[PDB]
Design a protein around this ligand. Structure first.
Ligand SMILES: Cn1nc(C(=O)NCCc2cscn2)c2ccccc21
Ligand SMILES: [Zn+2]
Length: 139
């Protein structure tokens, strides 16, 4: 689990979105595993606007943060789960690192702020859903 709070928005994995997230829907993209909902309270996380390929991510299955090198956001074929069939997920970044299904929602951060959130994994690789291109989150 996990979410990013910026301004009047909440950014979550689309497959983990609650009934309340869907009732206050702003934007969703099934190909990216992302959903954004509106909030009453003002969030204060900072979104990174950069092309960093190094950062740190939170791994709840180990209660630890790991520093990683990750690829640039792209279109990668990912295997099926109970939430999605096997498909091409877009705006996805991979890194060598540990992850489990329950780790989805953990934030990946660089010196500039929040880069994205854990969304896919397997074979000793962890995938993150990029949020740096969503410029409207700051207004
Ligand atoms: C981080 N992580 N996530 C999952 C997962 O099944 N849930 C996401 C659902 C999904 C499927 S394709 C994009 N999102 C996973 C499975 C094994 C190991 C690590 C993992
Ligand atoms: Zn950066």
């Amino acid at each position: 689990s996990g979410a990013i709070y910026v301004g009047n928005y909440r950014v979550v994995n689309r497959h983990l979105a609650t009934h309340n997230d869907w009732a206050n829907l702003v934007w969703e993209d099934s190909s990216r595993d992302l959903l954004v909902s509106s909030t009453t309270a003002q969030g204060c996380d900072t979104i990174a606007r950069c092309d960093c390929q190094t950062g740190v991510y939170y791994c709840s299955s180990r209660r630890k943060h790991y520093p990683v090198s990750f690829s640039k956001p792209s279109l990668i074929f990912v295997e099926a789960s109970e939430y999605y069939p096997a498909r091409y997920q877009s705006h996805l970044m991979l890194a060598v690192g540990h992850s489990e299904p329950g780790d989805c929602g953990g934030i990946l951060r660089c010196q500039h702020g929040v880069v994205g959130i854990v969304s896919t994994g397997g074979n000793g690789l962890v995938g993150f859903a990029d949020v740096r291109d969503l410029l409207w989150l700051d207004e």
